[model samples]
Target: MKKYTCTVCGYIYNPEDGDPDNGVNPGTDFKDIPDDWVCPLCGVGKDQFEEVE
Candidate 1:
């Protein structure tokens, strides 16, 4: 699974541990995250995220 990092807040999003605070469940891929989803830390949009190793 791929990991995405929030460029604005340095928050790392793991597909295996989805953002439950935003109603996203585990095993949900980054690409599948809702377009309206924001970073739990800084509340930035998905456009502020980038794929990371």
Candidate 2:
């Protein structure tokens, strides 16, 4: 697995963010972020995400 860090606020989006009620539920894949679930910190599209390492 890889690490994903928000460039604007350094928020890490791990398996935890994909939990219930998070708008992104469990089993959610990196390519499944809805158009509305923008990065809470950067307000950028999910495509803006990049690998940390």
Best by lDDT: 1
lDDT of 1 at 13: 97
Tens digit of per-residue lDDT, candidate 1, span 1-53: 99999999899999898988789999999998889999999988999899997
Cα RMSD (angstroms) for every candidate in the order listed: 0.7, 2.5
Q: How far is candidate 1 from the true structure (C-alpha RMSD, Å)?
A: 0.7
Clashes of each: 0, 0
Error of 2 at 8 (Å): 1.2
TM-score of each: 0.93, 0.59
**What is the C-alpha local distance difference test score of each model?**
0.92, 0.65
Q: Which residue runs does candidate 1 get wrong by more than 4 Å? A: none
Worst 10 residues of 2 by lDDT: 13-22
TM-score of 1: 0.93
Q: By TM-score, how accurate is candidate 2?
A: 0.59
